[PDB]
Amino acid sequence: EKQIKVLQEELQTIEYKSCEICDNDIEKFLELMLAYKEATVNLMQEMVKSPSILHILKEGRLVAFRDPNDCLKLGFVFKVSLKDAVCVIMTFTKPYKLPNGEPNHLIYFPKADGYRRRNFPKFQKTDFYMEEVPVTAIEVITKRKFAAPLGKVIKKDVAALNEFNAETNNILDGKTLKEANIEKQGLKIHQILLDRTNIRDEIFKLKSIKCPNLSQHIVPKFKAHVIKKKIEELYHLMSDQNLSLL
Amino acid sequence: RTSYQFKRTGLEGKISGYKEEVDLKVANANASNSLSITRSINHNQNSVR
Amino acid sequence: NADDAEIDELLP
Amino acid sequence: SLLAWQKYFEWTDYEDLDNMDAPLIIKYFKKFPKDPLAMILYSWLSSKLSKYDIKSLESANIEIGLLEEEVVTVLTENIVKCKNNILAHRILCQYYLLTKEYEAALPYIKNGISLIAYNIKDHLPLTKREFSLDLATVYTYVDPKDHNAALKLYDNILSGDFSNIQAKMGKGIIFIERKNWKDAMTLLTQVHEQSPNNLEVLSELSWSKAHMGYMDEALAGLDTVIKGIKGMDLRSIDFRALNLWRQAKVYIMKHASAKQENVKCAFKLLIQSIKILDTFAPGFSTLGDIYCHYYKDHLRAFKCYFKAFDLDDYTAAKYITETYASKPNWQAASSIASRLIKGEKAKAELRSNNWPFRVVGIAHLE
Numbered sequence: 001e002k003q004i005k006v007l008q009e010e011l012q013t014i015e016y017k018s019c020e021i022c023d024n025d026i027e028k029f030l031e032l033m034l035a036y037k038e039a040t041v042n043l044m045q046e047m048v049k050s051p052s053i054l055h056i057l058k059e060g061r062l063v064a065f066r067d068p069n070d071c072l073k074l075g076f077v078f079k080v081s082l083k084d085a086v087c088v089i090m091t092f093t094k095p096y097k098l099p100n101g102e103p104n105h106l107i108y109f110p111k112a113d114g115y116r117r118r119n120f121p122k123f124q125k126t127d128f129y130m131e132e133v134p135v136t137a138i139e140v141i142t143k144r145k146f147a148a149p150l151g152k153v154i155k156k157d158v159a160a161l162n163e164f165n166a167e168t169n170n171i172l173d174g175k176t177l178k179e180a181n182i183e184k185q186g187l188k189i190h191q192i193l194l195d196r197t198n199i200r201d202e203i204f205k206l207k208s209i210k211c212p213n214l215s216q217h218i219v220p221k222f223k224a225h226v227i228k229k230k231i232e233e234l235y236h237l238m239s240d241q242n243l244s245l246l
Numbered sequence: 247r248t249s250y251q252f253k254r255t256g257l258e259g260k261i262s263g264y265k266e267e268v269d270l271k272v273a274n275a276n277a278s279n280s281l282s283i284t285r286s287i288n289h290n291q292n293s294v295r
Numbered sequence: 296n297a298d299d300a301e302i303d304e305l306l307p
Numbered sequence: 308s309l310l311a312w313q314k315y316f317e318w319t320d321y322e323d324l325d326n327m328d329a330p331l332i333i334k335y336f337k338k339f340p341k342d343p344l345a346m347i348l349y350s351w352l353s354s355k356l357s358k359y360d361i362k363s364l365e366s367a368n369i370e371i372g373l374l375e376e377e378v379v380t381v382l383t384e385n386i387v388k389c390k391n392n393i394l395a396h397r398i399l400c401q402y403y404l405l406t407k408e409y410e411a412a413l414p415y416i417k418n419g420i421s422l423i424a425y426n427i428k429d430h431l432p433l434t435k436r437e438f439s440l441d442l443a444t445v446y447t448y449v450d451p452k453d454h455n456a457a458l459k460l461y462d463n464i465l466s467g468d469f470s471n472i473q474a475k476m477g478k479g480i481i482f483i484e485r486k487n488w489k490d491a492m493t494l495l496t497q498v499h500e501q502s503p504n505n506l507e508v509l510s511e512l513s514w515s516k517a518h519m520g521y522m523d524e525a526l527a528g529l530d531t532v533i534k535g536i537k538g539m540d541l542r543s544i545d546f547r548a549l550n551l552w553r554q555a556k557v558y559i560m561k562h563a564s565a566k567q568e569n570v571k572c573a574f575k576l577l578i579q580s581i582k583i584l585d586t587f588a589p590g591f592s593t594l595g596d597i598y599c600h601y602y603k604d605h606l607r608a609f610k611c612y613f614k615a616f617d618l619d620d621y622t623a624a625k626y627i628t629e630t631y632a633s634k635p636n637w638q639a640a641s642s643i644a645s646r647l648i649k650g651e652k653a654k655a656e657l658r659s660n661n662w663p664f665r666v667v668g669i670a671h672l673e
Contacts, residue, residue, distance in 0.1 A: 051618050052371040054586060055369075056370065082618070083642075181372075183376055184371070184372020184373070185372060187411055
C-alpha cells in the first residue's frame with residue numbers, strides 16, 4: 001500500500017490544461033485507439049502462425065514499426081525468422097521525438113492525408129543500421145517495396161546506394177502509405193482486420209479529431225491511463241489471511 | 247569454495263571433460279544452522295526420528 | 296558448380 | 308413468384324453445382340436480388356473457382372491466398388440470417404473445403420447433416436452422398452484420430468454406391484498414408500483403367516508402382532502429369548511442385564537399385580521445384596538428404612535442413628540438433644528440441660526415439 005499511496009500522490013500532482021478543442025471526447029478517443037492498437041497487435045501475432053507471411057513480408061518492403069521506446073519509424077525488411085518470430089529490418093531514420101523530447105503515442109492511420117499532415121507533416125532521415133525488430137512491434141506494412149538488392153547496399157555499390165537514396169527521398173516526399181489484400185492470409189486474419197476497420201470507422205466518427213494539437217492534448221490523459229493501469233496491476237492481493245487467531 | 251563441473255559433448259550425452267569453478271551455495275551448512283535441503287547430513291544422528 | 300551456385304543464390 | 312423460385316432452387320438437386328443453369332441464376336437475381344440464396348449463388352458464380360463465366364453470359368444475355376472478401380462476407384451474412392437452407396449449407400461447405408478450410412467447416416457440416424436428417428424425417432440421396440463425401444474428406448485431412456471412422460465411411464459409401472471415383476481415391480490416399488500399398492496398386496490400376504486421363508490419378512498410380520516392383524514407366528508416368536498442367540493458380544503451382552518432388556523421389560528410389568546422372572537430375576528437378584515454390588519444405592528436405600548422403604557436403608546440407616525445419620520434420624530437426632550438440636551448443640540444441648516437442652507434429656516418432664528429452668535435460672543440467 002505504500003507504493004499505491006506514492007503513485008496516487010504522483011498522479012495527484014499531474015497538471016492538466018483543458019481546451020475546448022479537445023475537451024469533448026478525448027477519453028473516448030483514447031479508448032478507441034487503444035482498442036485499435038490491441039486489435040492490430042492481435043492481427044500481427046495471428047499473421048505469423050503460417051509460412052505464407054514470407055511471400056507477404058518479402059525482402060525489400062517498406063514497413064513502419066514502433067521501437068521499444070514507443071517511437072514509430074520506417075525501415076526495410078531484410079530477413080524473417082519464424083522460429084524466433086523476429087525480423088531484421090534495415091532502418092534509415094531517427095525516432096520522431098517531440099520538440100520538447102517526448103515520443104508520439106498516437107495511432108498512425110494509413111491513407112489519411114489530412115490526419116497525416118496534422119500529426120506527422122515533417123520527418124527526419126539519418127544513416128542506416130541493422131536492427132532485430134520483434135514481429136509484434138510492426139505497426140503497418142506499406143505496398144511500396146524496394147526492388148533493388150540489399151546486399152549491394154551492404155557492399156556499398158555507388159549506383160545501388162544512389163538508387164536507394166533516391167527511392168528513400170521520393171518516398172519521404174509524398175506521405176500516403178496506403179495498405180499493402182492482406183486479408184487473404186486466413187479467416188481469423190479477416191475477422192481481426194474487420195474488427196480493426198470497425199474500430200477505425202468508429203474513431204473517425206468522432207468530432208474530437210479535427211484539432212491539430214492532438215499531440216498536445218492527450219499526453220496528460222495517456223499518462224493518467226498508464227498510471228492507473230500500473231496501479232491496478234500492482235493491486236494484486238493473492239493472500240487470503242485470517243487475522244482472527246491473533 | 248570450488249568444485250568440478252562435468253561437461254558433455256555429443257547427442258548421446260557422454261561426459262567429455264571437467265573444469266574447476268566457483269559454486270554459488272554458506273559454505274559449511276549443517277543441520278544446526280541452515281534450513282536448506284542441500285545442507286550436510288549427520289549420519290551419526292537418527293535418520294528416522 | 297552451377298548447381299551449387301543456384302542453391303546458394305536461392306538461400307543465404 | 309419468389310416462393311416458387313426459392314422452392315425450385317432448393318429442390319433442384321445438382322450432381323455438381325457447376326452444371327446449374329447460369330442464365331436462370333442471372334434471371335432470378337435480376338428478379339429478386341434481395342434473396343440471401345440469390346446473393347449466395349451470385350457470389351458462387353463470381354468466384355474464380357467455379358466453371359461459370361459471368362462476363363461471357365452477360366455479353367450473351369503474385370501472393371499466397373485464395374479466399375475472396377466479398378464471397379466470404381456474403382456467405383457469412385447469409386448463414387447468420389437463414390440458419391436453414393440446404394443449398395446455402397452445401398455452397399458454404401464446398402467453398403470451405405475448396406479453400407482448404409477443414410476445421411472451420413466441421414460445425415457447418417454438422418448443421419448440414421442435421422438439416423438433411425430433418426429432410427429425411429420429413430428423399431433424394433444425391434445431396435446426402437455429397438455431404439458424406441465432404442465430411443469424410445474433412446475427417447481424412449483434419450484428423451490420425453478419425454482416420455478409421457473416415458475409412459469406415461468410405462467403405463460404406465463404396466458398398467452403397469460403387470460409382471464414385473472420389474471415394475476410391477480417398478481410400479487410396481488413406482492406404483498410402485498408412486503404408487498399406489497392396490490394395491493401393493489395385494485401386495489405382497482400376498481407376499486408371501476407368502479413365503487414364505486424370506493427371507493426379509496417374510501421379511498416384513506411378514507413385515505406387517515405383518514404391519515397389521516396377522520402376523521403368525513409373526518415372527514417365529509423371530511426365531504427362533507435369534507437362535499437361537499449364538496452370539497459373541496457387542493450387543496449380545503447388546501441384547506442380549508436388550509432382551516435381553514425387554518424380555525426384557521415385558527417381559532417386561530407382562537410382563537406389565558410381566553413377567551420378569540420377570543424382571544430378573533429381574537435384575535439377577528439386578531446384579526447379581524450390582524456385583517455382585520458394586516455400587516448399589519437402590524440396591529443401593530432399594535437397595539436404597541428397598547433400599548429406601551422396602555429395603558428402605556439410606554446410607549445404609545444414610542450410611537446406613535449417614530452411615526446411617524453419618518452414619516446417621523429424622529428420623531435419625535431428626540433423627540440426629546433432630550439428631549443434633557436437634560443437635557443443637546446448638542452448639540452441641535445446642531450443643530446436645523443445646520446438647520439435649511442443650509442435651506435436653511428430654509425436655509418432657517421439658514414442659521410439661528419446662533424444663529430444665535427453666537434450667532438453669542435458670541443457671538444463673549445463
